[PDB]
Amino acid sequence: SVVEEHGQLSISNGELVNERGEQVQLKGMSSHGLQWYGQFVNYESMKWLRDDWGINVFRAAMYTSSGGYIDDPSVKEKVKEAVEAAIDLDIYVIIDWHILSDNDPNIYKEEAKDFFDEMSELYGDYPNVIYEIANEPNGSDVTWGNQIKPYAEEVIPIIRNNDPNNIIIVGTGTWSQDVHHAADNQLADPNVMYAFHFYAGTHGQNLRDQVDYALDQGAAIFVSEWGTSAATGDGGVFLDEAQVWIDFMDERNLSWANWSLTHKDESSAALMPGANPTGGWTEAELSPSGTFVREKIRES
Numbered sequence: 001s002v003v004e005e006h007g008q009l010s011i012s013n014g015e016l017v018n019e020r021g022e023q024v025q026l027k028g029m030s031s032h033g034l035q036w037y038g039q040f041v042n043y044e045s046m047k048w049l050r051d052d053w054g055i056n057v058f059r060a061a062m063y064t065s066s067g068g069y070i071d072d073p074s075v076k077e078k079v080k081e082a083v084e085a086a087i088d089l090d091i092y093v094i095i096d097w098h099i100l101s102d103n104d105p106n107i108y109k110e111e112a113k114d115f116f117d118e119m120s121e122l123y124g125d126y127p128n129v130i131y132e133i134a135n136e137p138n139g140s141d142v143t144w145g146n147q148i149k150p151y152a153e154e155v156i157p158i159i160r161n162n163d164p165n166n167i168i169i170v171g172t173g174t175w176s177q178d179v180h181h182a183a184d185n186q187l188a189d190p191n192v193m194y195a196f197h198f199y200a201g202t203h204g205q206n207l208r209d210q211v212d213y214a215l216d217q218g219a220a221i222f223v224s225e226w227g228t229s230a231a232t233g234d235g236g237v238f239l240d241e242a243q244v245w246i247d248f249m250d251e252r253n254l255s256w257a258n259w260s261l262t263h264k265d266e267s268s269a270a271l272m273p274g275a276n277p278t279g280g281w282t283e284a285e286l287s288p289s290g291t292f293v294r295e296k297i298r299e300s
């Protein structure tokens with residue numbers, strides 16, 4: 001129903017819109033690393049998230065390093081499983097080239113080009129797909145102008161040769177927080193968005209103001225990852241600040257995916273240890289984070 005109703009997504013005047021030019025907001029879940037917790041990514045679990053939580057997007061977090069795709073490329077097949085499930089379930093899907101320790105996206109740019117060529121050739125005639133080409137550029141030696149933007153200007157043409165206008169999300173500096181610099185030096189492609197990531201354990205008032213600055217430059221922003229925890233993915237749950245961010249994102253038409261769908265013993269994880277990897281969770285099988293996130297999506 002979601003993808004049939006909204007169809008082809010695009011950017012108009014800095015906003016995500018549907019094929020009738022109306023604003024749309026996506027809200028959903030990210031997987032954890034597919035090399036560690038891929039059992040939670042399947043048609044049945046995604047269907048349960050769609051029907052019981054109300055998700056309309058799912059993010060497939062394919063780590064490049066840390067045992068991910070560069071080390072063992074078989075994980076790309078789990079991305080394909082996720083995309084095919086989203087197509088069958090009529091929801092949107094984010095294909096996330098999940099850089100982190102490999103902090104400069106140029107480190108694995110050759111492999112990224114080949115991966116996004118393959119994915120856009122396979123899936124480029126479906127409206128479901130959103131390409132996230134570099135999760136979290138980071139380090140003082142990785143800047144928008146010097147590293148990230150030129151990386152994007154090599155990968156985006158590869159995608160566009162197969163898929164002329166599905167959305168592309170481009171990571172920003174400082175773990176996808178530096179939307180100010182991106183917004184002052186935007187890419188040419190009209191269907192690009194810049195990633196912004198937050199964790200509720202960080203006091204967020206200036207970060208909200210920086211998102212507003214970026215929006216005021218006409219840049220589109222997708223909150224492609226956020227958590228209720230501290231910035232480590234652990235360290236407690238911060239639901240007061242999470243709610244402030246939820247309300248901010250609703251006021252600003254910002255789409256989002258929450259980190260993450262796993263039973264790992266960390267506060268950002270949505271599930272508790274006994275949760276079935278094919279869905280059907282009871283209240284007791286959701287963590288405090290998962291309960292909150294489910295409520296936010298159901299309220300929506």
Ligand SMILES: OC[C@H]1CNC[C@@H](O)[C@@H]1O[C@@H]1O[C@H](CO)[C@@H](O)[C@H](O)[C@H]1O
Pocket residue numbers: 066100136197225231232233234259264266268
């Ligand atoms: O630190 C929380 C997030 C921030 N965004 C990137 C994402 O990969 C990260 O998740 C954590 O990553 C570390 C390192 O891979 C894992 O050990 C954590 O379990 C995970 O939450």
